[PDB]
Amino acid sequence: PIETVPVKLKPGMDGPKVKQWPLTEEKIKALVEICTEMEKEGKISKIGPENPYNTPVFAIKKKDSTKWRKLVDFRELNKRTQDFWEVQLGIPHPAGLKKKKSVTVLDVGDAYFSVPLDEDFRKYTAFTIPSINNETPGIRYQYNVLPQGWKGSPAIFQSSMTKILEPFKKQNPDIVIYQYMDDLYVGSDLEIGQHRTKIEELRQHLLRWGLTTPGYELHPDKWTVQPIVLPEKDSWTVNDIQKLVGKLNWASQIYPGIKVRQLSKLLRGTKALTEVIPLTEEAELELAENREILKEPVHGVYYDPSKDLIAEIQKQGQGQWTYQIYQEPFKNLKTGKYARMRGAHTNDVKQLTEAVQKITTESIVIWGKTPKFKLPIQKETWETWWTEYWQATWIPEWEFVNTPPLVKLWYQ
């Protein structure tokens, strides 16, 4: 018995119509079990083919969870409500959250089931549950409450959220709290023992307001950037200098001070690739000044809140993965490298799945946005396996790219 906030899509835009993809047996059972008890609790209610809209649905297990969690792919719906979570009820982003020594992520999504949803908007939350071997046609539902994973859900609940928090934000003044959809980010400069305690205090502080918490521990101060680096060799071959000159040529689009004239001079003959070429005085100095320019930050790179974030990922082999987050090409807001994630030396798709989650998490902490990914993988390969390794309650936007490594710019 609560007032329903009215929600309307973006101007001149129709709801989401996205086909449902095949589900494994263990995922369908989990959905049918989850969707049953959600219906006897009024949270969802069956519908029919008169509703033209549809969204994909599936189930995940968070890291170490052991328990199924329902995940809806509201990416198409969230793009068509974009005015809502930006214009009026948006959440400002705390620039100090990335500076805290420890940050914990909690699933507060179970609280969104408290608030009802505008009746005129429920027609857009429609999802279909498939059946093994198409034994049954599609069992369709729709959401009566705030759905988990909708970008409108945390905005509506914010008024109720900021009230439950206010007693604890006053009892602990300098502890930072941020809300990105179904997750709550809470960080302190306290020691680890003190930090984990205040989370339990925040868990109870949520229990008496009616919420469970089925937490992830981060350390943003630990996070490191990966700069462009030039090799160290005692002797340079023609091929070494050719690779170097090409790399500096590429890097010059980012750092304009890069020079290659004195290093190009060393190649001017027609030499065998393995021939050793002693460096001239001027090449050694052109090299040294180049190494220093790459040490510098890029001039005029800063975050723009109106602009979307893009992330490119490159597979370096031997479990190494490098990434760059940017808004304008060659103006990188962050560059980084992962190694020995789950799946190293056995599974590419699992590692890439882990990298996308890590990069998205970092982007939520640092800018409160999830980037659009450029995935080094074929479409059919990614869409076949990624749901088996997805451990998050959000899903970033992605596209598929095929960029042969002409030059190894980000990893030596």
Added chain:
Amino acid sequence: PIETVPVKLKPGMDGPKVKQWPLTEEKIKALVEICTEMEKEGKISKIGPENPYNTPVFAIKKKDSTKWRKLVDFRELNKRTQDFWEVQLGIPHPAGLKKKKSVTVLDVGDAYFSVPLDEDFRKYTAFTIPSINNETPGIRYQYNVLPQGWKGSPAIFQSSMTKILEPFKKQNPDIVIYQYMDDLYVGSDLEIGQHRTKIEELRQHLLRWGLTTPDKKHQKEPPFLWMGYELHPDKWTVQPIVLPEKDSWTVNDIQKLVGKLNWASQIYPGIKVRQLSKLLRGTKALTEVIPLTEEAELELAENREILKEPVHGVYYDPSKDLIAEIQKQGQGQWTYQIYQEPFKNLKTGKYARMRGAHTNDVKQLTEAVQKITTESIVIWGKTPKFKLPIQKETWETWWTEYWQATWIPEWEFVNTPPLVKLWYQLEKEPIVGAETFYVDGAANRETKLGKAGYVTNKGRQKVVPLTNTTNQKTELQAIYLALQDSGLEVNIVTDSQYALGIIQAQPDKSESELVNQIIEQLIKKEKVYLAWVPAHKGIGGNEQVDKLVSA
């Protein structure tokens, strides 16, 4: 009485006003016969000229029967009717059926006509009935039920049927009912006396809601005819497949043949359609006749020898693992078998899609593994364990070095040749003592004339004139030259991003005959190192050979 389904038109649009087709006198009498009986039952109604719509109507006789089908052309109503969301997400496959002690198959008589249409929407179904002459006008009618020919008839029937069956399924949890349109496959582990009793409770429960189960459609004894299959107590097979015997084949002949062969491929192992399909490409008219190649003839020959001997599939045992075994068939063709007990197939199939201009067998095998995984998750809800004709070390070399992410689920090597292999290996480091060829190419955009050549450190040189070429082709051609004019080990420097992208992915097949010749050379070499440098940076032999071939 079953709850009506609310329907609407596309907002701001009105109903269907289109004039009738001229109907044949043999069809009209059988048509007017069927229409008149409907009014007795409340399925159709007479309407006054107050209703201003009209839609064409016709009839064709039912397949495998004497009666006619009342088909209403609603194409213009369909354009202006609201959009639906179909609940028919696929087709069941018999290989996904568990074994049941007793099985029944029953069809509903007049499926759409037993479901009442939306009250407010009924008016838009307006159509008029012809006569033996053009003098009598014929009564105009509105549908009280789902019409055959509407775009909302299937979805509304399918979802309604589910709400009817839901109570029975919850009262009888151990009954498996495969619901596809109006046909119902019902099976149980119950003893057949008890099974037929529960069958009758369901026929009553459908009769509870006005759904008729005719005896003629009802089948009590194997082999059941279901979804175009024949279901036996422990085996299944397709209903027999008729291959046209035509002596001269048109385009529609091959299309019929190919489609039949694809249908056969689900259970008959090893069907191949590559050479037959090559005849289908780029033909203007369906009526045109095209001869059978000596390749396509041999393929149609061995395809018939597979269909000659009868085959059957088994049923699914959830306790045991799923196995999928793939064999290479050549020219980008692959067949597979899914089974649980050896030599007792559940189903078969084939992957033959040529994805991309240049590829290799490993990529294609991976695509086959992905097609099989998804089909398996559709039918059984799990991923099978794989038996693949590729050495463990081949795959380890491929997926680790390739620059894109790739993977195959749990799999083991099966020694059934022809094996999938990588046909050459580019060095990671330049080769000491191998001649260093700096290649380049160039072409004039208007002349379409170009050059391709190289310079080496040993003084070797060549330039070749080229007709009707492109910039990209001369760059590949320059690399071809360096491969021809070099020893078994060679370092090659290019500034062609395009060429290097193709060769580094280690293709073993190509649409381009030039790439196929480059591949042929690469297999011949012992050590090849490709390196890239940027153009017009005054680098080494690259600058020299750019001067030669630009002139």
Added chain:
DNA sequence: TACCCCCCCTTCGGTGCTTTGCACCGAAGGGGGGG
């Protein structure tokens, strides 16, 4: 001379980087199949 669903093979046109050529993908029209 109708409707809905799945599958394969081909064509063709949008799309973006490999650049005004070439490569990729998806919509669509051909067929098989279900009802």
